[PDB]
Motif scaffolding. Structure first.
Motif, short mmCIF file in Angstrom:
data_model
loop_
_atom_site.label_atom_id
_atom_site.label_comp_id
_atom_site.label_asym_id
_atom_site.label_seq_id
_atom_site.Cartn_x
_atom_site.Cartn_y
_atom_site.Cartn_z
N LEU A 288 0.92 -1.18 -0.09
CA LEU A 288 -0.36 -0.42 -0.59
C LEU A 288 1.16 1.63 -0.21
CD1 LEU A 288 -2.94 -0.70 2.47
CD2 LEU A 288 -2.89 -1.08 -0.29
N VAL A 289 2.27 1.21 0.75
CA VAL A 289 3.19 2.15 0.30
C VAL A 289 3.49 2.31 -1.13
CG1 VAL A 289 5.14 3.30 1.36
CG2 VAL A 289 3.87 2.22 2.45
N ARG A 290 3.69 1.34 -1.73
CA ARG A 290 4.37 0.65 -2.71
C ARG A 290 3.27 2.00 -3.49
NH1 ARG A 290 6.43 -4.11 -1.55
NH2 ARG A 290 4.61 -5.13 -3.15
N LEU A 291 1.60 1.48 -3.95
CA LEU A 291 1.45 2.19 -4.85
C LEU A 291 0.72 4.03 -4.12
CD1 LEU A 291 -1.18 -0.97 -4.24
CD2 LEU A 291 -0.62 -0.22 -6.14
N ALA A 292 0.83 3.69 -2.87
CA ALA A 292 0.78 5.44 -2.42
C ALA A 292 1.92 6.19 -3.53
CB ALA A 292 0.74 6.22 -1.29
N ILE A 293 3.22 6.30 -3.44
CA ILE A 293 4.31 6.61 -4.09
C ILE A 293 3.21 6.39 -5.79
CG2 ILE A 293 6.43 6.20 -4.87
CD1 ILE A 293 6.86 5.29 -1.37
N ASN A 294 3.49 5.58 -6.24
CA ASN A 294 3.34 5.39 -7.78
C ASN A 294 2.12 6.23 -8.22
OD1 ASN A 294 4.11 2.82 -9.41
ND2 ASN A 294 3.97 1.89 -7.08
N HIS A 295 1.54 6.88 -6.83
CA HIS A 295 -0.01 7.35 -7.64
C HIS A 295 -0.14 9.32 -7.28
CE1 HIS A 295 -3.46 4.38 -7.97
NE2 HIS A 295 -2.67 4.12 -7.72
N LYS A 340 -2.70 9.59 -0.50
CA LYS A 340 -2.25 9.82 0.84
C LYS A 340 -3.50 8.48 1.67
CE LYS A 340 -2.20 14.98 0.68
NZ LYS A 340 -3.29 16.41 0.46
N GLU A 341 -4.26 8.37 1.04
CA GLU A 341 -5.72 7.51 1.79
C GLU A 341 -5.28 6.42 1.92
OE1 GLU A 341 -8.73 7.56 2.91
OE2 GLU A 341 -8.49 5.45 2.95
N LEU A 342 -3.70 5.65 1.26
CA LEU A 342 -3.22 4.49 0.76
C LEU A 342 -2.11 4.77 2.08
CD1 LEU A 342 -3.22 4.41 -3.14
CD2 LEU A 342 -3.69 2.01 -1.56
N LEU A 343 -1.40 6.24 2.10
CA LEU A 343 -0.66 5.61 3.17
C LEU A 343 -1.80 5.64 4.33
CD1 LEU A 343 2.30 8.54 2.56
CD2 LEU A 343 1.90 5.92 2.52
N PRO A 475 6.12 -3.11 -6.98
CA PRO A 475 7.41 -3.51 -6.45
C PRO A 475 8.44 -1.92 -6.70
CG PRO A 475 7.75 -4.93 -7.79
CD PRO A 475 6.47 -4.65 -8.42
N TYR A 476 7.98 -0.66 -7.75
CA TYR A 476 8.92 -0.37 -8.40
C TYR A 476 7.55 1.21 -8.82
CZ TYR A 476 7.47 -1.25 -13.22
OH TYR A 476 7.03 -2.02 -14.78
N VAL A 477 8.21 1.87 -8.96
CA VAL A 477 8.05 2.80 -9.62
C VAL A 477 8.02 3.62 -11.18
CG1 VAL A 477 6.71 5.31 -10.24
CG2 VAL A 477 7.72 4.10 -7.66
N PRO A 478 7.42 2.42 -12.20
CA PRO A 478 7.63 3.02 -13.12
C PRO A 478 7.95 4.53 -13.86
CG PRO A 478 5.53 2.31 -13.76
CD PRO A 478 6.10 2.26 -12.39
N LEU A 479 8.93 4.76 -14.97
CA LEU A 479 8.45 6.69 -14.39
C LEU A 479 8.53 6.31 -16.58
CD1 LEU A 479 11.51 8.13 -12.77
CD2 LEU A 479 9.23 8.42 -12.39
#
Length: 512
Positions: A288-295, A340-343, A475-479
């Motif tokens: 969920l942290v990962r996803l938050a960072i992605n969004h 923010k919600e995910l975090l 498991p990452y943020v695609p750029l």
């Protein structure tokens, strides 16, 4: 031919941002290192320049059994290793040089180099010792590989830089003289250029190999310069001090192509750039942290700022120039409220502190962008900057939490991204190329299945599903898929931004 004849002769000055790290390509993994080694060494098979197509090299022909288990290579005769000031003996390439080059990686007793930081990183990462059951010299010009199971990428793998053919005679000579580390400093190959000099962080000089087995190089000499500042490097192009360069600042491209006598080559590229998240560490071990960072990172804006538009938004781990790309996956949407919600859901409603690693030669804007985007959701990012060799070493060892990562295809095959960078096998090797330490059995098992069948549609179906799984796990943020963008003087012809192993200079010439 007379127009062919006019192509021959001259010195090419190539400039780039960071020096190579070795002259033994099996010990390194990075494109900068391969600029030199790719011109010095050959492989059993090679990629036709400008393309991703396999063609003969140190093997003239080969036969593959119909179960995929046995590969027999017929070796080219009358090929000689380079002669230099440090290696004066004229020695013909044969099967023992293949055995040395491969067996040193396969068998720890034959490692050659002393115990120490040197590591056969690709070999380990890829699990080549699991793939290959045996290697045999059936005679002095015949090599037979038997595999433990069918391996669809194997033939293309044999064109990769880590499987370059070094000289056993030269290695034995250095061993007798107690100079084994020199195998990775003062190289001996069969390729179209030979080594002359390496001044660390300054320049490498390559000279034409007049005895090359293939079509002779056009150029007499290549100077590979390291000019770390990308603006300084472009200025050197503008003054004619250098002639061809990688790594432009993308906000200078419009200026450069306006100028007299400068061309900027552009193509879609075989490149991917992303943010590694170290999934074994605190915070980043929570999806969920990962996803938050992605969004929380607006990739459309990132592409505008960092790349000035010269890139495509990354969705899957490899670019759409390769077959098997999943066009059905939707990128994660920029959505701060959701982030923010995910975090909050993960238990970090006031964020956290973390660190991003970046390199000295990348645009500094990139780390600053990520820091600014993540501060919007309460993640306080400290920026640590490392020179390229240090960066490769520290990220290989898992020191980072977040870090920029990039890859240029070695072969046009999803395996070269998905398995080499994202598998459990790749994560098991130390140092690693799986910078996220992504360990998923479901993902890795599909990749293994996709090696064991050769039909492309069958493999595509498996790779489509694999792309779903890693998208879900984030498991990452695609750029970005950056475009390949290469400024050069108009007189420099023959260079190609397309295909793999692009920094071989044998086809480059100066127009006269």
């Amino acid at each position: 031919s007379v127009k062919e004849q006019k192509r021959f002769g001259g010195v090419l000055v190539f400039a780039r941002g960071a020096d190579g790290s070795s002259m033994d390509p099996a010990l390194v993994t990075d494109g900068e290192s391969y600029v030199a080694t790719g011109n010095i060494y050959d492989t059993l098979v090679q990629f036709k320049y400008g393309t991703t197509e396999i063609e003969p090299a140190l093997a003239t022909s080969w036969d593959i059994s119909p179960d995929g288990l046995v590969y027999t290579f017929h070796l080219r005769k009358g090929v000689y290793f380079h002669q230099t000031k440090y290696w004066n003996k004229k020695v013909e390439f044969s099967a023992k040089d293949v055995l040395f080059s491969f067996e040193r990686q396969m068998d720890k007793a034959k490692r050659y180099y002393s115990p120490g930081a040197k590591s056969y990183k690709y070999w380990e990462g890829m699990g080549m010792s699991h793939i290959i059951k045996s290697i045999e010299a059936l005679d002095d010009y015949t090599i037979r590989f038997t595999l433990n199971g069918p391996e669809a990428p194997f033939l293309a793998n044999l064109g990769m830089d880590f499987l370059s053919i070094l000289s056993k005679d030269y290695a034995d000579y250095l061993e007798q003289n107690n100079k084994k580390d020199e195998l990775a400093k003062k190289p001996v190959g069969t390729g179209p250029f030979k080594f002359f000099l390496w001044n660390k962080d300054e320049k490498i000089i390559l000279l034409k190999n007049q005895d090359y087995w293939g079509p002779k190089a056009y150029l007499d000499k290549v100077v590979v310069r390291t000019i770390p500042n990308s603006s300084t490097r472009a200025l050197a192009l503008r003054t004619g001090e250098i002639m061809l360069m990688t790594g432009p600042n993308l906000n200078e491209v419009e200026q450069l192509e306006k100028l007299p006598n400068i061309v900027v080559d552009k193509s879609a590229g075989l490149l991917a750039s992303w943010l590694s998240l170290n999934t074994q560490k605190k915070y980043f071990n929570n999806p969920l942290v990962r996803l938050a960072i992605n969004h929380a990172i607006n990739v459309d804006d990132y592409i505008k700022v960092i790349y000035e538009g010269f890139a495509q938004k990354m969705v899957n781990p490899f670019p759409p120039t390769i077959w098997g790309y999943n066009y059905n996956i939707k990128p994660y949407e920029y959505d701060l409220k959701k982030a923010k919600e995910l975090l909050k859901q993960a238990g970090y409603p006031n964020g956290f502190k973390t660190t991003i690693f970046t390199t000295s030669t990348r645009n500094p804007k990139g780390a600053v962008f990520i820091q600014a985007s993540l501060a919007k959701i309460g993640i306080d990012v400290k920026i640590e900057v490392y020179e390229w060799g240090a960066y490769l070493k520290r990220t290989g060892l898992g020191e980072h939490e977040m870090a920029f990562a990039g890859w240029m295809a070695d072969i046009a095959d999803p395996d070269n991204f998905l398995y080499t960078l994202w598998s459990k096998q790749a994560a098991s090797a130390i140092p690693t190329q799986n910078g996220s330490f992504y360990k998923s059995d479901a993902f890795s098992d599909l990749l293994i299945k996709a090696k064991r069948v050769s039909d492309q549609k069958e493999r595509e179906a498996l790779y489509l599903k694999a792309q779903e799984i890693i998208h879900k796990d984030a498991p990452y943020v695609p750029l970005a898929y950056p475009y390949s963008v290469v400024p050069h003087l108009s007189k420099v012809k023959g260079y190609k931004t397309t295909g793999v192993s692009v920094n071989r200079f044998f086809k480059v010439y100066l127009e006269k």
